[PDB]
Structure formats: structure tokens, C-alpha cells
Amino acid sequence: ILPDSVDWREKGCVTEVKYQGSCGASWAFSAVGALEAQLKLKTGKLVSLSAQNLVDCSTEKYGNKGCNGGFMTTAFQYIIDNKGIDSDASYPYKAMDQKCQYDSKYRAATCSKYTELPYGREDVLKEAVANKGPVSVGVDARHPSFFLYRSGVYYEPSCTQNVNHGVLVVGYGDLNGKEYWLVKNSWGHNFGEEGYIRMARNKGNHCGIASFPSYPEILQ
Ligand SMILES: Cn1c(=O)n(C2CCN(CCCn3nc(-c4ccc(Cl)c(CNC(=O)c5ccccc5)c4)ccc3=O)CC2)c2cc(Cl)ccc21
Known part of the structure; x- marks a missing residue:
């Protein structure tokens, strides 16, 4: 039995919202x-990891x-092959x-494997978010309604299932019966709800949220 709602931010597993700039x-x-x-x-420590490391090295x-x-x-595969990723502090984001x-001296995490979830299966995505942790997903963000979003549960009738923007599902729930996915974006803390968007859940793979989900694991 899965929880009706999940929010990994409350469990100290989500770093501050980042801003990818241009x-x-x-x-x-x-x-x-x-x-x-x-x-x-795995370790009890929350550390921001280097997105710049991936931009520069997972090419x-x-x-x-x-x-x-x-x-x-393939970012996860780079971290596996490389046997590490640097901290954001040591390898900061320059856009x-x-x-x-x-530099392995500043390694802050490793990755042992990653798992891909089946296309369009929002039930499997819910299970992974509840049982494994936040899940990387793509969304179709090429809609003004998306980047103009301020609050509530986002629903865009023109959305497609073809993704073009990577985001992170950090939970799920419902707003007065409107089910949603709790999504961490990288457009700074003035986008949406302090950097997050609540996106329609169980509405036919809305905006492709469950088209290509994946998550890494750190194994002993
Ligand atoms: C070593 N290696 C790989 O392992 N792959 C993989 C990459 C992932 N695909 C899985 C396809 C699933 N899939 N994912 C997306 C997708 C998911 C998340 C995100 Cl945010 C995006 C957005 N990314 C891009 O649009 C993009 C732009 C420029 C360069 C790369 C990606 C797309 C879209 C269509 C699709 O069938 C299998 C081959 C490789 C692919 C290439 Cl072209 C070259 C080397 C590869």
C-alpha cells in the first residue's frame, strides 16, 4: 500500500532549487x-552535486x-564509468x-546503476517515487502556460508526450481531488511555487511526465 502523498523535501533529500540560466x-x-x-x-548527508561536471564531461x-x-x-552512465562526480562547491555551475x-579529490558521490521505468506508466512511477526516491523525468515544457505557471495543479490541453526538458519528481499528492506530481525545476526559486510545479497526475501521461523516467542507485 503506497502512501496517498509523498514529499521528499520534508525528508531532507532535496537540495535548494538551482537556476540553469541560458x-x-x-x-x-x-x-x-x-x-x-x-x-x-545512503550516507545521511545532503550535498549539492556538480551539474557543470556533467555538462563538461558527459559529452x-x-x-x-x-x-x-x-x-x-547517460549522465548516470558517465558517473558510473567515471567512478564519481564532484561536489557543486568544488565544480560550480557556470552555465x-x-x-x-x-578531479577525483573532490568526489562527492558515486553511482552503481540506474533503472528506467516503462513508457507512460504513471502507476510504476508512483511506486518508484514512494519506494525508491525522487525520479528523473522528461516533460514537454514548450508551452507558455508551462513557463508562466504560478500555482495550483498544471494542466495544458495542448501538451504532448514528447519530452524536451529534464526535471525531477520529488513527490505526489492531490489538491482538493486534483492529483499531481510534485516537480523540482531548475529555473530558480521564482519559477512556479518557489521553484516547483505541481503537474497533473493520472491524466494520460500529461506532458510526457512518465514517458522516460529513470533513477540512480548507490549500492554497497
Ligand atoms: C551511449 N549512448 C546511450 O546510451 N544513448 C542512449 C540515450 C537514451 N536513449 C533512450 C531513448 C529514450 N528517449 N528519451 C528521450 C529524452 C528523455 C529525457 C530528456 Cl531530458 C530528453 C531531452 N533531451 C534531448 O532532447 C537531447 C538533446 C540533445 C542531445 C541529447 C538529448 C529526451 C526522448 C526520446 C527517447 O526515445 C537510448 C540511447 C545514446 C544516444 C546517443 Cl545519440 C549517443 C550515445 C548514446
């Missing part, structure tokens, strides 16, 4: 956000294009494509 690095912020929660679950071999887009799954500056 660099299309949402995939990198989605990936580090998911791994940040697993690091807290053409991983199909990623830095400030021009990428995949959360630019740079040469790789990874």
Missing part, C-alpha cells in the same frame, strides 16, 4: 538531483551536447560549455 542543462540538474537524494539516503560519447541538451540516463575539470 544553458540548456536541465538534463544535468535532473540527474544530479536524483543522485543527491540517493546520497542522502559526445554519452550522446549529450552540454548546454544544447542531453539525457539523464557554459567548458573543458572537463573533473
Whole structure:
């Protein structure tokens, strides 16, 4: 029996909202956000991890294009292959494509594996968010209603299931019966509800939220 509502922020597993600026690095912020929660679950410490590390180092071999887009799954594979990712403090975000500056001396997390969830299955996504932690997802954010969102449960009839923006599902619930996914964005804390958007849940894979979910794990 899953909880009716989940909010990983209340459990100390979510870092402060980040601001990607003019660099299309949402995939990198989605990936580090998911791994940040697993690091807290494993070690008890909450540490912001380096999105810039992914932008600069998880590149053409991983199909990623830095400030021009990428995949959360191949970001996880880079962290696995590299045997680490630096802290955000040591490798801070510059919103630019740079040469790789990874230094194992400042490693703050590792990744053992990642799991992809089946396309469009919001029931499986709910289970993963409840039982595993925050889940990286793509959404279709190419709608003014999306970036103009201020509060409430977001529903856009013109939304598609084809994703183009990486975000992090940190919980779920309902607002007076309107079910939602609790989504951490990387557009700063003045977007939406202090940086978050509550997106329609169980409305036919609204905006592609459950099209391509994935989450990392840190295993002993
Ligand atoms: C080593 N390696 C891989 O493992 N892949 C993977 C990448 C993930 N796909 C899974 C496809 C699932 N899928 N995901 C998205 C998707 C999910 C999240 C996000 Cl936010 C985005 C947005 N990202 C982009 O639109 C993007 C832009 C520029 C460069 C890369 C991605 C897309 C869209 C369609 C689709 O079938 C399998 C091959 C590789 C792909 C390439 Cl092109 C080159 C090397 C790769």
C-alpha cells in the first residue's frame, strides 16, 4: 500500500532549487538531483552535486551536447564509468560549455546503476517515487502556460508526450481531488511555487511526465 502523498523535501533529500540560466542543462540538474537524494539516503548527508561536471564531461560519447541538451540516463552512465562526480562547491555551475575539470579529490558521490521505468506508466512511477526516491523525468515544457505557471495543479490541453526538458519528481499528492506530481525545476526559486510545479497526475501521461523516467542507485 503506497502512501496517498509523498514529499521528499520534508525528508531532507532535496537540495535548494538551482537556476540553469541560458544553458540548456536541465538534463544535468535532473540527474544530479536524483543522485543527491540517493546520497542522502545512503550516507545521511545532503550535498549539492556538480551539474557543470556533467555538462563538461558527459559529452559526445554519452550522446549529450552540454548546454544544447542531453539525457539523464547517460549522465548516470558517465558517473558510473567515471567512478564519481564532484561536489557543486568544488565544480560550480557556470552555465557554459567548458573543458572537463573533473578531479577525483573532490568526489562527492558515486553511482552503481540506474533503472528506467516503462513508457507512460504513471502507476510504476508512483511506486518508484514512494519506494525508491525522487525520479528523473522528461516533460514537454514548450508551452507558455508551462513557463508562466504560478500555482495550483498544471494542466495544458495542448501538451504532448514528447519530452524536451529534464526535471525531477520529488513527490505526489492531490489538491482538493486534483492529483499531481510534485516537480523540482531548475529555473530558480521564482519559477512556479518557489521553484516547483505541481503537474497533473493520472491524466494520460500529461506532458510526457512518465514517458522516460529513470533513477540512480548507490549500492554497497
Ligand atoms: C551511449 N549512448 C546511450 O546510451 N544513448 C542512449 C540515450 C537514451 N536513449 C533512450 C531513448 C529514450 N528517449 N528519451 C528521450 C529524452 C528523455 C529525457 C530528456 Cl531530458 C530528453 C531531452 N533531451 C534531448 O532532447 C537531447 C538533446 C540533445 C542531445 C541529447 C538529448 C529526451 C526522448 C526520446 C527517447 O526515445 C537510448 C540511447 C545514446 C544516444 C546517443 Cl545519440 C549517443 C550515445 C548514446
